[PDB]
Design an enzyme around this catalytic site. Structure first.
Site, PDB file in Angstrom:
ATOM      1  CG  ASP A 183       2.289  -8.939 -13.559  1.00 49.35           C
ATOM      2  OD1 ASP A 183       1.617  -7.863 -13.578  1.00 49.35           O
ATOM      3  OD2 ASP A 183       1.919  -9.961 -12.948  1.00 49.35           O
ATOM      4  CD  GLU A 204      -2.758   1.394   0.036  1.00 44.23           C
ATOM      5  OE1 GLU A 204      -3.192   2.568  -0.300  1.00 44.23           O
ATOM      6  OE2 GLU A 204      -3.158   0.394  -0.613  1.00 44.23           O
ATOM      7  CG  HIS A 231      -1.178  12.655  -8.555  1.00 43.51           C
ATOM      8  ND1 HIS A 231      -2.501  13.029  -8.331  1.00 43.51           N
ATOM      9  CD2 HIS A 231      -1.241  11.418  -9.137  1.00 43.51           C
ATOM     10  CE1 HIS A 231      -3.294  12.054  -8.759  1.00 43.51           C
ATOM     11  NE2 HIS A 231      -2.573  11.083  -9.264  1.00 43.51           N
ATOM     12  CG  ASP A 232       5.992  16.649  -6.959  1.00 44.79           C
ATOM     13  OD1 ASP A 232       7.132  16.448  -6.493  1.00 44.79           O
ATOM     14  OD2 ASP A 232       5.472  17.804  -7.048  1.00 44.79           O
ATOM     15  CG  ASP A 270       7.322  21.630  -8.129  1.00 46.63           C
ATOM     16  OD1 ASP A 270       6.605  20.679  -7.715  1.00 46.63           O
ATOM     17  OD2 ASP A 270       6.840  22.756  -8.488  1.00 46.63           O
ATOM     18  CB  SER A 286       4.401  21.730  -5.752  1.00 50.30           C
ATOM     19  OG  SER A 286       3.808  20.718  -6.556  1.00 50.30           O
ATOM     20  CB  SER A 302       1.390  -3.615 -13.593  1.00 44.43           C
ATOM     21  OG  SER A 302       1.549  -5.019 -13.388  1.00 44.43           O
ATOM     22  N   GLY A 326       6.298  21.329 -12.059  1.00 42.98           N
ATOM     23  CA  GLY A 326       6.640  19.950 -12.383  1.00 42.98           C
ATOM     24  C   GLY A 326       7.139  19.176 -11.192  1.00 42.98           C
ATOM     25  CD  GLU A 350      -2.260   5.765  -1.901  1.00 40.93           C
ATOM     26  OE1 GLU A 350      -2.232   6.745  -2.863  1.00 40.93           O
ATOM     27  OE2 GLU A 350      -3.472   5.317  -1.748  1.00 40.93           O
TER      28      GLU A 350
HETATM   29  C1  HEM Z   1      -4.514   8.866 -17.728  1.00 45.45           C
HETATM   30  C2  HEM Z   1      -3.678   8.779 -16.687  1.00 45.45           C
HETATM   31  C3  HEM Z   1      -4.013   8.286 -15.381  1.00 45.45           C
HETATM   32  C4  HEM Z   1      -5.244   8.284 -14.731  1.00 45.45           C
HETATM   33  C5  HEM Z   1      -6.578   8.838 -15.190  1.00 45.45           C
HETATM   34  C6  HEM Z   1      -5.042   7.611 -13.478  1.00 45.45           C
HETATM   35  C7  HEM Z   1      -6.049   7.361 -12.527  1.00 45.45           C
HETATM   36  C8  HEM Z   1      -5.881   6.702 -11.305  1.00 45.45           C
HETATM   37  C9  HEM Z   1      -6.932   6.502 -10.325  1.00 45.45           C
HETATM   38  C10 HEM Z   1      -8.361   6.993 -10.487  1.00 45.45           C
HETATM   39  C11 HEM Z   1      -6.384   5.793  -9.299  1.00 45.45           C
HETATM   40  C12 HEM Z   1      -7.075   5.373  -8.031  1.00 45.45           C
HETATM   41  C13 HEM Z   1      -6.966   6.419  -6.913  1.00 45.45           C
HETATM   42  C14 HEM Z   1      -7.881   6.062  -5.749  1.00 45.45           C
HETATM   43  O1  HEM Z   1      -9.146   6.140  -5.914  1.00 45.45           O
HETATM   44  O2  HEM Z   1      -7.371   5.669  -4.669  1.00 45.45           O
HETATM   45  C15 HEM Z   1      -4.999   5.590  -9.639  1.00 45.45           C
HETATM   46  C16 HEM Z   1      -4.069   4.902  -8.848  1.00 45.45           C
HETATM   47  C17 HEM Z   1      -2.704   4.778  -9.089  1.00 45.45           C
HETATM   48  N1  HEM Z   1      -2.042   5.373 -10.158  1.00 45.45           N
HETATM   49 FE1  HEM Z   1      -2.902   6.121 -11.860  1.00 45.45          FE
HETATM   50  N2  HEM Z   1      -3.715   7.260 -13.329  1.00 45.45           N
HETATM   51  C18 HEM Z   1      -3.037   7.697 -14.474  1.00 45.45           C
HETATM   52  C19 HEM Z   1      -1.688   7.644 -14.671  1.00 45.45           C
HETATM   53  C20 HEM Z   1      -0.738   7.203 -13.733  1.00 45.45           C
HETATM   54  C21 HEM Z   1       0.710   7.232 -13.945  1.00 45.45           C
HETATM   55  C22 HEM Z   1       1.358   7.891 -15.133  1.00 45.45           C
HETATM   56  C23 HEM Z   1       1.302   6.713 -12.822  1.00 45.45           C
HETATM   57  C24 HEM Z   1       2.693   6.610 -12.490  1.00 45.45           C
HETATM   58  C25 HEM Z   1       3.758   6.437 -13.283  1.00 45.45           C
HETATM   59  C26 HEM Z   1       0.196   6.290 -11.967  1.00 45.45           C
HETATM   60  C27 HEM Z   1       0.350   5.545 -10.794  1.00 45.45           C
HETATM   61  C28 HEM Z   1      -0.700   5.062  -9.992  1.00 45.45           C
HETATM   62  C29 HEM Z   1      -0.517   4.227  -8.836  1.00 45.45           C
HETATM   63  C30 HEM Z   1       0.773   3.545  -8.457  1.00 45.45           C
HETATM   64  C31 HEM Z   1      -1.747   4.063  -8.281  1.00 45.45           C
HETATM   65  C32 HEM Z   1      -2.117   3.199  -7.100  1.00 45.45           C
HETATM   66  C33 HEM Z   1      -2.105   3.832  -5.739  1.00 45.45           C
HETATM   67  C34 HEM Z   1      -2.434   2.812  -4.622  1.00 45.45           C
HETATM   68  O3  HEM Z   1      -2.594   1.633  -4.949  1.00 45.45           O
HETATM   69  O4  HEM Z   1      -2.460   3.182  -3.421  1.00 45.45           O
HETATM   70  N3  HEM Z   1      -1.047   6.559 -12.550  1.00 45.45           N
HETATM   71  N4  HEM Z   1      -4.689   6.148 -10.866  1.00 45.45           N
HETATM   72 CA   LIG Z   2       0.479  -6.593 -11.809  1.00 49.18          CA
HETATM   73 CA   LIG Z   3       4.685  19.422  -8.491  1.00 51.48          CA
HETATM   74 MN   LIG Z   4      -4.189   3.349  -2.187  1.00 48.96          MN
END
Ligand code: HEM
Ligand SMILES: [Ca+2]
Ligand SMILES: [Ca+2]
Ligand SMILES: [Mn+2]
Ligand SMILES: *[C@@H]1O[C@H](CO)[C@@H](O[C@@H]2O[C@H](CO)[C@@H](O)[C@H](O)[C@H]2NC(C)=O)[C@H](O)[C@H]1NC(C)=O
Ligand SMILES: *[C@H]1O[C@H](CO)[C@@H](O)[C@H](O)[C@@H]1O
Length: 357
Positions: free
Chosen positions: A198, A35, A46-47, A64, A66, A174, A62, A39
């Protein structure tokens, strides 16, 4: 240089990252792709992505720090719901490891977190981002209800990313779960292997959806192929954005091209992360500290497989020019639960610090 704790490293400025990695692992990750690691990986994105070429520097700086330096601003935007946990977990490290900027801490912590995920690449890590910035403006973070056109434009405006790079970065899904998309369930994974870096997410998004892990009425969510949950083992969730990317003509071939291509996926993710981690900076002005990133856990080397209750008859294919690979199906008639914890169990509460976000 030789660190006080006798490690030879490339540059003296790299030395302080050694105790930081140790502290992150002992305190929040425990060498797991769990977990708190997930996060922090989400926070790296997001940063970094809160920057706009068209709007100019006042919209955001970017990668940074922030999020850490202005914890009451961006974390409270609707598109950043849930980012508070990672921010509040990293602020104590910023305060303690006070020779390393907030920006460098975020990117380094993500590289450390990812290294715990079997199959992940060893990210490039450049250091030397300043410790002073501005709060970003709202509207810079992609949301799961967004169209492909909107998503691709956002990434192009942030950093010139190509569609190939965008889909490459979604290899992060993944190792990803959702807490806020559905108010009735927590930790809903995006693939059946949320502790393993994976290619399963690429495969599983291409299966026909059959139900929902929680309610049927959430913004940004579509039907999942593996919705069964029990106890804390929440069923798989599917984001509208991932579904749309898997089927849109701009991205469908790229999406499919990662199925069962683990080394290609990992290399592609590494290359796009090299660009993401330096948004807001000239890479020629950052020092190479890649040698202090931990060596990642290796994959087992096994091919991708259809989970039990699915198979090739369930595929919704959208790439006319590339052959979909021949994969095995795990035996069983009904869906297996996706474990809530890396050791297969049900309960494994992570460390969470209180804080201002
Ligand atoms: C179109 C682009 C993306 C959208 C719309 C998107 C959307 C989301 C959403 C809605 C969640 C769930 C948040 C929640 O309700 O707790 C999430 C989780 C996550 N996102 Fe994405 N995401 C995108 C791109 C990315 C990218 C580029 C990365 C990193 C390189 C990323 C890494 C993650 C990770 C690791 C989680 C899991 C967090 C957890 O399990 O605690 N995401 N994303
Ligand atoms: Ca996986
Ligand atoms: Ca930032
Ligand atoms: Mn989470
Ligand atoms: C980066 O800026 C932060 C925030 O101003 C600094 O954080 C402070 O760190 C000191 C220890 O050096 C603590 O006494 C303060 O409580 C921290 N402030 C806040 C608001 O948390 C940090 O030291 C700076 N780091 C670098 C490398 O300059
Ligand atoms: C996971 O569990 C399912 C039943 O829930 C089985 O069908 C599958 O073979 C695996 O054991």
């Amino acid at each position: 240089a030789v660190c006080p704790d006798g490690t030879r490293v490339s540059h003296a400025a790299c030395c302080a990252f050694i105790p930081l990695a140790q502290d992150l692992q002992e305190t929040i990750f425990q060498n797991e792709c769990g977990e708190d690691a997930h996060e922090v990986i989400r926070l790296t994105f997001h940063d970094a992505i809160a920057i706009s070429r068209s709007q100019g520097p006042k919209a955001g700086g970017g990668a940074d720090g922030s999020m850490l330096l202005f914890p009451t601003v961006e974390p409270n935007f609707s598109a950043n719901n849930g980012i508070d946990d990672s921010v509040n977990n990293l602020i104590p490290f910023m305060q303690k490891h006070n020779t390393i900027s907030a920006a460098d801490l975020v990117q380094f912590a993500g590289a450390v977190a990812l290294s715990n995920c079997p199959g992940a690449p060893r990210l490039e890590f450049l250091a030397g981002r300043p410790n002073k910035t501005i709060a970003a403006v709202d509207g810079l973070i992609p949301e799961p209800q967004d169209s492909v056109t909107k998503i691709l434009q956002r990434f192009e405006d942030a950093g010139g990313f190509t569609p190939f790079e965008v889909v490459s970065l979604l290899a992060s899904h993944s190792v990803a779960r959702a807490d806020k998309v559905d108010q009735t369930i927590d930790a809903a994974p995006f693939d059946s292997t949320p502790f393993t870096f994976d290619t399963q997410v690429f495969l599983e998004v291409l299966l026909k959806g059959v139900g929902f892990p929680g309610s049927a009425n959430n913004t940004g969510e579509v039907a999942s192929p593996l919705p069964l949950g029990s106890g804390s083992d929440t069923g798989e969730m599917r984001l509208q954005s991932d579904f749309a990317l898997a089927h849109d003509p701009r991205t469908a071939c790229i999406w499919q091209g990662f199925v069962n291509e683990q080394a290609f996926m990992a290399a592609s993710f590494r290359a796009a992360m090299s660009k993401l981690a330096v948004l807001g900076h000239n890479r020629n002005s950052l020092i190479d500290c890649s040698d202090v990133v931990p060596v990642p856990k290796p994959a087992t080397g096994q091919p991708a497989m259809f989970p039990a209750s699915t198979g090739p008859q369930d595929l919704e294919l959208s790439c006319p020019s590339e052959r979909f690979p021949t994969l095995t199906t795990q035996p069983g008639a009904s869906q297996s639960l996706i474990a809530h914890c890396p050791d297969g169990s049900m309960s494994c509460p992570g460390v969470q610090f209180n804080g201002p976000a």
